[PDB]
């Protein structure tokens, strides 16, 4: 019973209050809706940053480059965060957004195979260039927030060109929140090596009854904001629209 005018104002305000510029795109069935305080972001291109982990994992598992239970050893060298100085599964690495695990996986896959799986999946601008281990962080691979939500819609519905079983395994890695019988599956993205910095939270809500509502939040990370603003805004918006 809320006017759409009021949903629009309430969601814009969640971005206004964090003092950033951003958008969240929601997909109900085949219908895309854009909210936020910077609507024109919707079809601009940004690096996927760690959102790429979802595709990177799909590629690695499908092509037998790791298993769901394989433990990637920490090599013992100092890491940018101490939470990374441990051995982990791809799943654990997904939750921690541990890039060196995912770069290990990228190296196993190899530049050639990576390029072909990324052209095959039609992901973003599909260009990975010559560096197998940072293409999703500093370019040249770029994707828009529309493409990101459509990629989430595909994964959520198992429509990507990977075995059903590969898709279920990557989806088990993605559960970040349970809120009143709804489950939020998603991956965060933080473009730290680019100016300005991009922040993403891409996924879908799986409702009490099996409807799945894909979404993609996309904003600018400002000097010392924390990661969880991405989540917080996503959750405020989703609740505001009665999706969760
Ligand atoms: B991801 O979006 O969660 C993510 C995690 C850790 C590190 C990065 C990253 O963007 N590193 C970039 C780096 C390369 C040169 C300078 O900084 C992303």
XYZ file of C-alpha atoms and ligand atoms in Angstrom:
262
model
C 0.000 0.000 0.000
C 2.963 2.492 -0.077
C 3.121 4.802 -3.160
C 5.956 4.049 -5.523
C 6.902 7.715 -5.094
C 7.617 6.985 -1.396
C 9.645 3.733 -2.154
C 11.719 5.821 -4.571
C 12.348 8.558 -1.984
C 13.099 6.048 0.851
C 15.648 4.081 -1.248
C 17.416 7.272 -2.663
C 17.763 8.361 0.988
C 19.640 5.182 1.967
C 22.332 6.213 -0.587
C 22.095 9.905 0.380
C 22.705 9.071 4.061
C 25.833 6.948 3.359
C 27.071 9.983 1.404
C 27.655 8.114 -1.762
C 26.248 7.746 -5.258
C 24.667 4.439 -6.139
C 22.010 2.271 -7.627
C 20.194 -0.957 -6.845
C 18.574 -2.889 -9.606
C 15.797 -5.446 -8.668
C 14.428 -8.060 -11.049
C 10.879 -9.430 -10.586
C 10.489 -12.081 -13.204
C 11.467 -10.334 -16.482
C 10.968 -6.747 -15.114
C 14.043 -4.629 -14.091
C 13.632 -1.684 -11.712
C 16.265 0.863 -10.880
C 16.390 2.620 -7.493
C 18.914 4.765 -5.685
C 20.214 8.297 -5.848
C 22.145 7.912 -9.103
C 19.940 6.144 -11.597
C 22.255 6.646 -14.684
C 24.863 4.290 -13.138
C 22.561 1.425 -14.281
C 24.175 1.007 -17.748
C 27.692 2.284 -17.074
C 30.602 -0.231 -16.947
C 32.724 -0.910 -13.772
C 35.259 -3.609 -12.890
C 33.419 -6.559 -11.311
C 36.096 -6.850 -8.626
C 35.325 -9.675 -6.208
C 31.851 -10.252 -7.814
C 33.997 -12.109 -10.363
C 34.643 -14.806 -7.723
C 31.294 -16.365 -8.571
C 32.243 -16.858 -12.258
C 35.862 -17.730 -11.342
C 34.474 -20.533 -9.033
C 32.059 -21.799 -11.714
C 34.912 -21.995 -14.214
C 37.322 -23.672 -11.790
C 34.919 -26.360 -10.562
C 33.450 -27.175 -14.006
C 36.935 -27.617 -15.496
C 38.176 -29.801 -12.538
C 40.677 -27.247 -11.259
C 39.598 -27.643 -7.570
C 36.922 -29.406 -5.565
C 34.522 -28.057 -2.973
C 36.497 -29.645 -0.120
C 40.093 -29.034 -1.333
C 42.107 -26.988 1.128
C 44.147 -24.151 -0.504
C 47.314 -23.810 1.704
C 48.381 -20.432 2.931
C 51.965 -20.079 1.722
C 53.019 -18.242 4.952
C 53.750 -14.861 3.292
C 52.122 -11.762 4.954
C 48.721 -10.894 3.458
C 46.848 -7.608 3.282
C 44.426 -8.896 6.128
C 45.258 -11.417 8.862
C 41.942 -13.264 8.326
C 43.593 -14.534 4.992
C 46.715 -16.020 6.687
C 45.142 -19.496 6.936
C 44.292 -22.454 4.744
C 40.827 -22.471 3.207
C 38.240 -23.948 0.847
C 36.886 -21.957 -2.135
C 33.699 -21.561 -0.017
C 35.606 -20.021 2.945
C 37.590 -17.915 0.473
C 34.294 -16.769 -1.007
C 32.986 -15.546 2.417
C 36.239 -13.837 3.248
C 36.646 -12.535 -0.288
C 40.258 -14.023 -0.160
C 41.736 -12.901 -3.553
C 44.948 -14.971 -3.339
C 42.896 -18.200 -3.280
C 40.954 -17.008 -6.274
C 44.180 -15.986 -8.013
C 45.494 -19.500 -7.358
C 42.304 -20.821 -8.955
C 42.774 -18.319 -11.890
C 46.309 -19.559 -12.416
C 45.207 -23.208 -12.466
C 42.537 -22.406 -15.053
C 45.064 -20.443 -17.216
C 44.734 -17.320 -19.449
C 43.551 -19.287 -22.558
C 40.875 -21.389 -20.821
C 39.780 -18.314 -18.784
C 39.287 -16.227 -21.994
C 37.184 -18.935 -23.659
C 34.929 -19.514 -20.606
C 34.405 -15.753 -20.221
C 33.551 -15.274 -24.006
C 31.329 -18.425 -23.631
C 29.425 -17.069 -20.686
C 28.986 -13.608 -22.264
C 29.995 -11.864 -19.038
C 30.206 -8.072 -19.118
C 32.453 -6.775 -21.957
C 34.038 -10.309 -21.982
C 37.665 -8.949 -22.349
C 40.286 -10.435 -19.921
C 43.510 -9.094 -21.673
C 46.828 -10.795 -20.875
C 47.052 -10.991 -17.069
C 45.195 -14.105 -15.785
C 45.347 -13.107 -12.083
C 44.053 -9.470 -11.866
C 41.755 -8.843 -14.941
C 38.685 -8.666 -12.758
C 40.366 -6.104 -10.420
C 41.999 -3.448 -12.539
C 40.484 -4.043 -15.961
C 40.121 -4.602 -18.806
C 37.089 -6.715 -17.763
C 34.094 -4.438 -17.003
C 30.363 -5.083 -16.508
C 27.304 -2.881 -15.963
C 24.870 -3.171 -13.001
C 22.153 -4.415 -15.430
C 24.409 -7.176 -16.735
C 25.350 -8.002 -13.121
C 21.728 -8.460 -12.035
C 21.051 -10.538 -15.224
C 24.038 -12.704 -14.409
C 22.599 -13.242 -10.867
C 19.223 -14.055 -12.394
C 20.836 -16.670 -14.580
C 22.771 -18.239 -11.675
C 19.771 -18.175 -9.371
C 17.723 -20.042 -12.027
C 20.558 -22.365 -13.147
C 20.558 -20.992 -16.712
C 24.304 -20.457 -17.094
C 26.285 -22.828 -19.431
C 27.793 -25.026 -16.622
C 26.592 -28.375 -15.185
C 23.605 -27.953 -12.841
C 25.847 -29.498 -10.128
C 28.590 -26.801 -10.625
C 25.908 -24.094 -10.217
C 24.517 -25.652 -6.958
C 28.003 -25.929 -5.474
C 28.783 -22.216 -6.100
C 25.344 -21.246 -4.815
C 25.942 -23.168 -1.437
C 29.064 -20.744 -1.173
C 26.917 -17.624 -1.426
C 24.489 -17.710 1.543
C 25.127 -14.520 3.572
C 21.835 -13.857 5.407
C 18.703 -15.597 6.568
C 15.964 -13.029 7.477
C 12.414 -14.259 8.392
C 12.366 -17.409 6.261
C 14.006 -15.581 3.286
C 17.573 -16.389 2.330
C 19.956 -13.875 0.788
C 22.571 -15.404 -1.571
C 25.039 -12.799 -2.878
C 28.675 -11.769 -3.417
C 30.235 -8.448 -2.492
C 32.567 -6.479 -4.709
C 35.048 -3.843 -3.796
C 37.177 -2.251 -6.566
C 40.184 -1.199 -4.495
C 42.638 -0.818 -7.327
C 40.712 1.611 -9.464
C 39.734 5.338 -9.171
C 37.080 5.930 -8.076
C 36.414 2.734 -6.140
C 33.376 0.655 -7.009
C 31.268 -1.360 -4.471
C 28.863 -4.065 -5.491
C 26.555 -6.537 -3.775
C 25.093 -8.891 -6.371
C 22.757 -11.818 -5.663
C 19.167 -12.730 -5.178
C 16.584 -13.206 -2.424
C 15.084 -16.689 -2.168
C 11.690 -16.086 -0.601
C 9.863 -18.430 1.942
C 8.015 -19.960 -1.086
C 10.735 -20.348 -3.778
C 10.285 -17.068 -5.800
C 13.817 -15.740 -6.377
C 14.356 -11.947 -6.722
C 17.732 -11.048 -8.166
C 19.372 -7.732 -7.343
C 22.586 -5.775 -7.878
C 23.627 -2.860 -5.780
C 26.374 -0.670 -7.247
C 27.929 2.387 -5.482
C 31.110 4.464 -5.142
C 33.253 3.524 -2.028
C 34.583 6.809 -0.522
C 37.894 7.242 1.523
C 37.252 5.152 4.738
C 33.650 3.841 4.348
C 33.315 0.217 5.529
C 32.298 -2.799 3.455
C 29.111 -3.503 5.260
C 27.411 -0.267 4.054
C 26.850 -2.299 0.853
C 24.931 -4.975 2.775
C 23.115 -2.440 4.945
C 21.781 -0.492 2.048
C 20.876 -3.619 0.133
C 18.934 -4.912 3.165
C 17.164 -1.575 3.830
C 16.042 -1.407 0.205
C 14.944 -5.025 0.011
C 12.842 -4.594 3.244
C 11.492 -1.270 2.112
C 10.129 -2.993 -1.044
C 8.757 -5.894 1.040
C 11.100 -8.331 -0.776
C 12.489 -9.490 2.603
B 37.093 -7.879 -3.573
O 36.277 -6.875 -4.339
O 36.441 -8.353 -2.306
C 38.634 -7.574 -3.395
C 39.339 -8.098 -2.291
C 40.713 -7.778 -2.041
C 41.497 -6.976 -2.881
C 40.833 -6.466 -4.011
C 41.568 -5.525 -4.940
O 40.758 -4.796 -5.528
N 42.926 -5.392 -5.039
C 43.504 -4.384 -5.942
C 44.975 -3.971 -5.905
C 45.807 -4.211 -7.016
C 46.654 -3.121 -7.189
C 46.381 -2.194 -6.187
O 45.363 -2.717 -5.398
C 39.421 -6.737 -4.244
